[PDB]
Design a binder for these strands. Structure first.
Length: 98
DNA sequence: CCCCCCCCTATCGAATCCGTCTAAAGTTA
């Protein structure tokens, strides 16, 4: 997909349609994104992909990342609660605590 | 003429010596 403007238009239309559908049909919507590397000077940071304008589309945004052998859940953007950090784990039973 | 975005890579390079112990066996008028 070489044309960035076309991708931006498609993503904006998709976000509008998804929020309209979620509000109209009383639905909870979850989307999954991928990280990417942003380089400034000589250090690199992991940021969500798909540009910057995509950040306004999601009502709530969460970020998972590694710290030693621990998994952390961070509430990045939300209009109802405050930023927090949560430790979670993956077990044979599934998504769990600790 | 109009309005918005992308991405990690790759190993290197040796130094520095110390600290002594344990005696035994008589001979030939």
């Amino acid at each position: 997909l070489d044309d960035l403007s076309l991708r931006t238009r498609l993503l904006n239309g998709l976000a509008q349609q998804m929020i309209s559908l979620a509000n109209n049909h009383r639905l909870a919507v979850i989307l999954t994104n991928q990280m990417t590397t942003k380089i400034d000077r000589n250090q690199a940071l992991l940021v969500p992909a798909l540009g910057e304008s995509w950040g306004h589309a999601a009502t709530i945004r969460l970020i998972f990342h590694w710290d030693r052998k621990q998994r952390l859940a961070t509430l990045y953007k939300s209009p109802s609660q405050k930023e927090c950090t949560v430790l979670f784990q993956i077990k044979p039973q599934g998504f769990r605590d600790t």
